[PDB]
Design goal:
Number of strands: 36
GO cellular component, one term: host cell nucleus
CATH superfamily of the largest domain: Ribonuclease H-like superfamily/Ribonuclease H
GO molecular function: 5'-3' exonuclease activity; DNA binding; DNA polymerase activity; DNA-directed DNA polymerase activity; nucleotide binding; RNA-DNA hybrid ribonuclease activity
Distance between the termini: 68 Å
Shape: globular
CATH topology of the largest domain: Nucleotidyltransferase, domain 5
Subcellular location: Host nucleus
Structural class: alpha+beta
EC number: 2.7.7.7, 3.1.26.4
CATH class of the largest domain: Alpha Beta
GO biological process, one term: DNA-templated DNA replication
Number of helices: 22
Bound molecules: calcium ion
Length: 835
């Protein structure tokens, strides 16, 4: 029989391109020791380990590397009678795929699943682990993408009388498509219904009737959205099936624990037979969303595996010291270190070294690892680059680490490996992720950042977290070379074997290749220490849970999608649908009198809340607000020369305001629990509160991106305009209320002994986007941070609407103002700060 859907990774191989350095032939005379061999060879790829020899692709008892694999090439290697009961499972990632009833006809799927994919359907696959550490895939059927179109606009254009007709028109349009890739589509592939909704833009916008159109496929949806009737605005055609699955099932998360349960008519999840598995899992199920519930109370991460890896390459052209280029057949990967950790316990479980050529690790290294209590390295030796790279990808498929890390693996190691596998060898990669074929496995190097030469990676079912990104984001350093970072962060100074050394070491023999290997392993151990110090997976999963997107999109997609998805949830609840697209300048100088610094706390979010700014509260038209009282019911403000109106919360509440309010409440609840929490809970709660802060701080930016997911440049501009007005108001208030010491003392009598011998004055000397510096001649610094707290409260109360909050941040005893955003000063505690 064999698998229902073909496995595309290699499970057999009998011929391959053999490329190896000739220096590995110490049996050859000296003139024949330079360059690489490069020829075809007709034998099975092999690996050598400790005197034994195996075929790379053979699966059975005596393998050289660990496996967490049930099927291999369509043979079921599970023990006889393997049949674990699954109740709860953890989901770390979610895939979207199309299945076709016809293609699945000989998989014994129950009828309710077949109906969902007749003739085609989107299947949401939840990937994860049981408590027992079994790898699971749960295939959810019955999620449809949908978009909206204005009913009046559609009827007037297409002469539609009823939803049946619209379905005919869309079916017809696809039939007639260029390239004909929708032959066989009928008006049965669509369902249209009439609903009442409101466009999220502008206060005056009335509710209207829309067609809501359900589609079975993302491919069909993307075509309709950019081809069908381009004069008719579409709404929410950009929303993926995963998002509909998450938002349409209250409580569902993209990362967390679930339980299988009975569905509506006591339906049950159906276990798939092994030959119908779509992924490299131990167990697979078919279900609908009603067979799933969130499992509250479960919070511990299951035993996911982390692979930390690093490659070493050897340029083999005319210059041994040239940077290696993957397209050059002679520029080889020569080693790969691969450390496998349990992500729940942080324990290092396996230390693997893949070596092109024989490789004898130094006894000193082996003794050191033993002393540190770490696993004894397994050295896998190979005769050619292909055999080695195939073994590494074989390990990736068979062990299936859910998380992968390294240092600069996104910009160097993965691109280099995948360039060799695709361009030199012609290995398809689409079965090397979690899916057994047809899965995403792609790197794309990205533009604009042309100097930094950045990249993204997507590998289905694998979360790649590059520690270089984590550390450049999190720590300020002069150099982000791994050795410099290991000194700065781990306080773990170590030697560098330089790239200049590698060619001479490689050529010497197995002992010196062993020195290369030691240094490659030490590289990966350091990265592992960095990973387990910063725990970036806990940060990223916190954001994924909050934003309703998978952890993969959390890493690689930008800030906008986070806010968008949260907005989409709220907007739907409220009946909206989202359409598819000088006096503050510093006079430079040195001040020896104290300079108090007042900062607004989360200024832009606070403005959005305080002034009820939103897409939905804005009007560009005075007649929109003619029924309302000025001041009492709306804010009128000039922004870029236009008059804008924003109605107040009692007229209509801002969606953005609701999001921010609710997040800030949630962050307050979390930060209140941290002091009573146990130390592991404190780590999780800390990751959660931090995730909330990043999403809140992204709302302003979300509104200001022209050509973004849902721009409202009017909101963005209003925020900066109110910002500027607030700083000026603060300056004016300070200049007026506290021009004399008597007035200061009258408000704060603890000032009475802070009075220094010099003349009293209080003046704003600098102001940036959210802070103001106040020069307090005639006051001593000592009590001034306390009086500053009270000045800040006082101003906040006098001038501004909650939740706007001015705070006294610090006091400089001495300060050098250089320019905008450039200053040096000493804080009252004696510490120097430079910006
Ligand atoms: Ca690396
Ligand atoms: Ca390296």
């Amino acid at each position: 029989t064999g698998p229902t859907q073909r496995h595309t990774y290699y499970s057999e191989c009998d011929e391959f391109r053999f490329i190896a350095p000739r220096v590995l032939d110490e049996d050859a005379p000296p003139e024949k020791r330079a360059g690489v061999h490069d020829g075809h060879l007709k034998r099975a790829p092999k690996v050598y380990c400790g005197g034994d020899e195996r075929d790379v692709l053979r699966v059975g008892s005596g393998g050289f590397w660990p496996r967490r694999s049930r099927l291999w090439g369509g043979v079921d290697h599970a023990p006889a009678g393997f049949n674990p009961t699954v109740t709860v499972f953890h989901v770390y990632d979610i895939l979207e795929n199309v299945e076709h009833a016809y293609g699945m006809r000989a998989a014994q799927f129950h009828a309710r699943f077949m109906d969902a994919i007749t003739p085609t359907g989107t299947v949401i696959t939840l990937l994860g682990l049981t408590p027992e550490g079994h790898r699971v895939a749960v295939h959810v059927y019955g999620t449809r993408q949908y978009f909206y179109m204005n009913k009046e606009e559609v009827d007037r254009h297409l002469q539609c009388r009823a939803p049946r007709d619209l379905c005919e028109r869309m079916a017809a349009a696809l039939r007639e498509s260029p390239g004909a890739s929708f032959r066989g589509i009928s008006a049965d592939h669509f369902e249209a219904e009439v609903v009442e909704r409101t466009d999220v833009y502008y206060y005056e916008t009335r509710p209207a009737l829309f067609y809501r159109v359900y589609v079975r496929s993302g491919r069909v949806l993307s075509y309709l959205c950019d081809n069908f009737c381009p004069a008719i605005k579409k709404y929410e055609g950009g929303v993926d099936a995963t998002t509909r699955f998450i938002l349409d099932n209250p409580g569902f998360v993209t990362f967390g624990w679930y339980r299988l349960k009975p569905g509506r008519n006591n339906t049950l999840a159906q276990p798939r037979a092994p030959m119908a598995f779509g992924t490299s899992s131990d167990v697979e199920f078919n279900c609908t969303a009603d067979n799933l519930a969130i499992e509250g109370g479960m919070s511990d991460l299951p035993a996911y595996k982390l692979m930390c890896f690093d490659i070493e390459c050897k340029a083999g052209g005319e210059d041994e010291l040239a940077f290696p280029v993957a397209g050059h057949p002679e520029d080889l990967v020569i080693q790969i270190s691969c450390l496998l950790y349990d992500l729940s316990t942080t324990a290092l479980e396996h230390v693997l070294l893949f070596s092109l050529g024989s490789c004898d690790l130094p006894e000193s290294h082996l003794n050191e690892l033993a002393a540190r209590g770490l696993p004894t390295p397994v050295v896998l030796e190979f005769d050619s680059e292909f055999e080695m790279l195939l073994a590494f990808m074989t390990l990736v498929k068979q062990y299936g680490p859910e998380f992968v890390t390294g240092y600069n693996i996104i910009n160097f190691d993965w691109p280099f490996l995948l360039a060799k596998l695709t361009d030199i060898y012609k290995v398809p990669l689409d079965g090397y992720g979690r899916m057994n074929g047809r899965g995403v496995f792609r790197v794309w190097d990205i533009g604009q950042s042309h100097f930094q030469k950045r990249s993204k990676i997507k590998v289905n079912g694998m979360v790649n977290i590059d520690m270089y990104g984590i550390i450049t984001d999190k720590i300020k350093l002069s150099s982000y070379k791994l050795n410099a970072v290991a000194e700065a962060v781990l306080k773990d100074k170590k030697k560098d074997l330089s790239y200049r050394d590698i060619p001479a070491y490689y050529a010497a023999g197995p002992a010196q290749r062993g020195v290369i290997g030691e240094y490659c392993i030490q590289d990966s151990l350091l990265v592992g220490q960095l990973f387990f110090k910063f725990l970036p997976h806990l940060e990223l999963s916190a954001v994924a849970r909050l934003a309703g997107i998978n952890i993969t999109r959390t890493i690689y997609d930008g800030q906008q999608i986070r806010v968008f998805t949260c907005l989409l949830r709220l907007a739907d609840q409220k009946g909206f649908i989202l359409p598819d697209t000088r006096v503050l300048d510093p006079t430079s100088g040195f001040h020896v009198n104290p300079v108090v610094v007042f900062d607004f706390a989360s200024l832009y979010p606070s403005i959005i809340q305080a002034h009820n700014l939103c897409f939905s509260t804005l009007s560009l038209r005075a007649d929109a607000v003619a029924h309302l009282e000025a001041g009492k019911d709306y804010l009128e403000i000039e922004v870029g020369g236009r008059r804008l109106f924003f109605v107040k919360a009692h007229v209509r509440e801002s969606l953005l305001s609701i999001l921010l309010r609710d997040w800030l409440a949630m962050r307050k609840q979390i930060r209140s629990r941290i002091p009573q929490s146990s130390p592991e809970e404190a780590v999780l709660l800390d990751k959660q509160q931090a995730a909330i802060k990043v999403v809140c701080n992204s709302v302003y930016g979300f509104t200001g991106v022209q050509h973004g997911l849902l721009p409202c440049l009017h909101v963005a501009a209003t925020v900066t305009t109110i910002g500027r007005e607030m700083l000026l108001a603060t300056r004016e208030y300070v200049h007026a209320r506290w021009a004399a010491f008597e007035q200061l003392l009258a408000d704060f009598p603890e000032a009475a002994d802070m009075r220094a011998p010099g003349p009293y004055s209080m003046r704003i000397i600098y102001g940036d986007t959210d802070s103001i510096f106040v020069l307090c001649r005639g006051l001593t610094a000592a009590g001034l941070t306390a009086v500053g707290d009270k000045m800040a409260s006082h101003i906040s109360r006098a001038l501004f609407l909650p939740p706007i909050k001015l705070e006294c941040e610090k006091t400089f005893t001495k300060l050098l103002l250089i320019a905008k955003k450039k200053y040096i000063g000493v804080i009252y505690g004696g510490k120097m700060l430079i910006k």
